[PDB]
Amino acid sequence: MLRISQEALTFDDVLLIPGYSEVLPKDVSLKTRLTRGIELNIPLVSAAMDTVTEARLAIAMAQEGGIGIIHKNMGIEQQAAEVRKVKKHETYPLASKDEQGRLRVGAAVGTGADTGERVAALVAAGVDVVVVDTAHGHSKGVIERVRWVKQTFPDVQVIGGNIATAEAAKALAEAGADAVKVGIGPGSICTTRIVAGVGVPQISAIANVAAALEGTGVPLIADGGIRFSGDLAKAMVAGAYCVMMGSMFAGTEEAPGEIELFQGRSYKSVPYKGALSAIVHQLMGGLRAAMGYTGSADIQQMRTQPQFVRITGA
Amino acid sequence: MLRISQEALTFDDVLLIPGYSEVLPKDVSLKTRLTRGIELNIPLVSAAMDTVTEARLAIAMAQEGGIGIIHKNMGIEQQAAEVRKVKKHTYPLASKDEQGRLRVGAAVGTGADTGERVAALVAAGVDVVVVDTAHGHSKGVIERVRWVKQTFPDVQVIGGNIATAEAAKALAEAGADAVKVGIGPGSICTTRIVAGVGVPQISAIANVAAALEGTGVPLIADGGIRFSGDLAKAMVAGAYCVMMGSMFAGTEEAPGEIELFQGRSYKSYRVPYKGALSAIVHQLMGGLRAAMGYTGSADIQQMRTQPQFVRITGAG
Amino acid sequence: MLRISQEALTFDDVLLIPGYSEVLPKDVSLKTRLTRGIELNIPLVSAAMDTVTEARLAIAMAQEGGIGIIHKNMGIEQQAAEVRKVKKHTYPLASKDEQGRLRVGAAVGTGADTGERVAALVAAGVDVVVVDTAHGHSKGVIERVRWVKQTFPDVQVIGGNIATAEAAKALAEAGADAVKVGIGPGSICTTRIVAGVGVPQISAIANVAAALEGTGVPLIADGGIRFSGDLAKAMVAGAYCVMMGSMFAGTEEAPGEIELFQGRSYKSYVPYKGALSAIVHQLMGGLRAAMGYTGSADIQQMRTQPQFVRITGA
Amino acid sequence: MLRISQEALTFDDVLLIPGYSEVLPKDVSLKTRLTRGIELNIPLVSAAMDTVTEARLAIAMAQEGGIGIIHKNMGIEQQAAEVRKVKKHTYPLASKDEQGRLRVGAAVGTGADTGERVAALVAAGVDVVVVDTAHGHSKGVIERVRWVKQTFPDVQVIGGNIATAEAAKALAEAGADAVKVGIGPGSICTTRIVAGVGVPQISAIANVAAALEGTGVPLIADGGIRFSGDLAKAMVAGAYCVMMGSMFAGTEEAPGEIELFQGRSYKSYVPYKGALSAIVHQLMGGLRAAMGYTGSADIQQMRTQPQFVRITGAG
Incomplete structure (x- = not known):
């Protein structure tokens, strides 16, 4: 009577099967949703990590057509100030913008004592989405905090996580x-x-x-386990609406930290990775190639039509 | 054709699925049973190995809320003397008998002088006798367990090692x-x-x-535990507690004396020096509490009976 | 639910089961088809790679009883000239057309000048045109295959690359x-x-x-072949023949010139591998041994009768 | 339509499940059969390889209670002479025929002079002829086996190598x-x-x-055995005994002479492995331990009663 719910698969267990294709990689649509109310032109979000997303990288992510979630390892006023820098920033045709034409940004909050105050300062600063973000989203604390944000600030989008089950969703x-x-x-x-x-x-x-x-209209964001652009394509076909990247964006010019030379190589103080735009370009290229192979003209098709094969270790 | 009873899984084949949670890791209950009659405040037992459990480490285990099983690689009177040191020795979780003395166990085999060993250990005040061999589903172990229960009804007896329903x-x-x-x-x-x-x-x-x-008989998981994550998995599989061996070898309290070799510390009688037992216990507990937080298990009974696993491949 | 088409197996997942045998390895027939109209005496084709097949190696492949596909990483007239060298060039197994000339194929893509390339190759006497891209199950490849068949009915055309029943x-x-x-x-x-x-x-x-x-259309297995054992497995899985690439690179006949470097031999434009005939002899030896084990007297039997066992990682 | 007959398992895919035990490892019976007519006191046979079995190692195998199969990479008379040395040669388990002589086998192929080789081996007193090729499920091996049985009805004959029910x-x-x-x-x-x-x-x-x-025909497991644990698994899967090859190469008794090279010992024509008896003792110890764990009092029980679990890579 060992209680095994299912066999569960990760990215390396599966490959996408090619299908009949008419639309070239360069011409497929990458438009998707972050939340019920926020559309993105590319399905990429930067993680709320202190080595990844502050104002500078959040601006670059919005300009690329994605979004950044500003980390919460800082004071309330500091985090609000980071949001404000993004909202007030002045050629980027895919840029993620609100109704006023300002760059979109998110910010992370926990469930600890001052969360209510943090949320209020972030909302007043013009944040587009509040991410109620803990190790365990299927918990009384996160569920209640999500409800509270929705009831108190009905005009802000709220994301809850992290989860891994149908019941938690x-x-x-x-x-x-x-x-x-x-x-x-x-x-x-x-x-x-x-x-x-x-x-x-x-x-x-x-x-x-x-x-x-x-059928609920609620998007899901895949957060974790993505090492290559191929994994981004697999996440979408499994049903993700977009994908959150963390350490992959750490060490970019726009990410926090300053460049440092050490034994003939460049690091931030983590290897130095150059402009965020180069990594995004490569990740997008791979997704577009996969959509070309599967014959998916847009994200909606990519999420719902292509099939996987399951493969062995060999 | 080929007589395969089942596919059998080890710790790395499975992961625990998070479930709805209301109780924080720091507030879950870790109380469990070693045996029908012995409760422990944490589900950890130290193994009857000569590099792991003598009086000193058995005292520290009891103080932490677990228990130590004194090894049998020594003379009868020496083993009895080790039990006596534990029984005659602030720690609010301490495992204690009805007289307020620290609990201790002791291992015995099935060889010629076992009866004499058991009698000396019982006279020394031992709380549990572990009839401990490579193959517990055998005439020798089953008979010795029965003999200890009948001869010394006030002592708890553990039998092993086993791996099947029928042996249990x-x-x-x-x-x-x-x-x-x-x-x-x-x-x-x-x-x-x-x-x-x-x-x-x-x-x-x-x-x-x-x-x-439904029998009230506890089971102790002995072997294959490398990380605190494995301790949580063992509990959800049905263990009441877990026996650790080489993980506790090399601690300050374990046998051996500290030795410096090429700028590093070892214990000598080969094994790295690991510092105070309490630090390793704290890490193992932390991990179990986190897992109970993730699965939504408020106590050991819930942890053993409610959470589910997912099975994963090599790629996972 | 997760859309899995099947569990898919590679060469290392399977082994051939021995069967009742009466015909020795040296006596089995290796005759097969490349296409509806082209027979080969051995089931080997050299890949259209610039480190593998130009006129010299194509001549040697034909002489061995297989065929070479001349690569397309060169100008139209250059590729035509390579085909002409093959057509105008003791070998009893030699692959020859009705005029007694050595057979040769040539690769084309789907880009702007493909029509012109095909016409020059056909005028040069090419036996088979390979319409060869990363994704054969696509509007561009399907239409180009149709165009070659309609415009040049007397040349054989191969389409690829594909991986599914539907694409086939x-x-x-x-x-x-x-x-x-x-x-x-x-x-x-x-x-x-x-x-x-x-x-x-x-x-x-x-x-x-x-x-x-039942269609009479052959299939050529292209990729993943490291040992002669994999060649046998590909045939039992249903291939009519097998295309080798980097395995033939570095042979005397392949492009490049020999170069000595740190006491070893390489080709330059990759280890030097000696005469193509020695590698072909090894690959054939292995296929013949496998046919001996499975009891297959000829290719038709090898493709249809023997069984596999599936094996684990262990 | 990929024609897969089954998933097939090797030694590392499985483990033996312990069962109720009453008989100690030292007291279990290891007696088994090589063939319909030849009993062995231990289930071990040495392979017909030129680095493994000539007269010297065949004598040692028979003395241990097993048997050696003399290799065929030599002339007919030379092979016959090796058989004769064994037949004409403190060991209570020794494998002996009705005349009290040590048992020995000898390998033959299916090539031109096989009939002559079989006859010389039979005249030399060989106990069993092994018709031994890469592919036993073939016209040549089947016909040669039939020929040996018809021509020399008083010698035992083994056919191989095979891997299927149909070939058996x-x-x-x-x-x-x-x-x-x-x-x-x-x-x-x-x-x-x-x-x-x-x-x-x-x-x-x-x-x-x-x-x-139900046919009374034994099967000998030949290959893939690296540890004594694999010997136990082979028996529980149904083998009557197990043939060892490279594991016995480099022993004192095996062919070759000892050679020192860079402070280590090798055999020369491969590490030097000491006396055959030490390796046999270790292999037997492991089998006895496994019979102790499974509760099998003898080989018949070991082959028919214990069960396996199948395990993953992680296990």
């Missing part, structure tokens, strides 16, 4: 979440897996959440 | 107050290489747990 | 005289890492073979 | 007194790499054992 949707963020123990050597023994392989987690939210 | 029932029938689970648990064990014998530990624990459900 | 039928319906099978066939392929796309080659071959059964 | 039945039908199982049994073997051919050895043994059940 429904609980957050029911609490009023405008999107959910998917990813608990998504990588092989994650702390969560080693220390706690907890996780769900990310391809199955995405598919389980996608099936649970089908 | 035979030991429960013989009067065992708990069973110890682990035969060829883990990849490069001698038992697997030399004899070709073993059962992956997650399946072994689940098979024994299902066999003993 | 689309190319057969467009008039292809054979199809070429292989998309993301190897472990560390760019297609898999960058795009997340591929089908393990044993399953791709079987799926295409089953789709084309 | 064809050899049993031809009159084989035992079959030898193993085609592409190891991971990096030539047959797999060059030809793409093989059957993982645990499945091959079980498939052959099921096909021969």
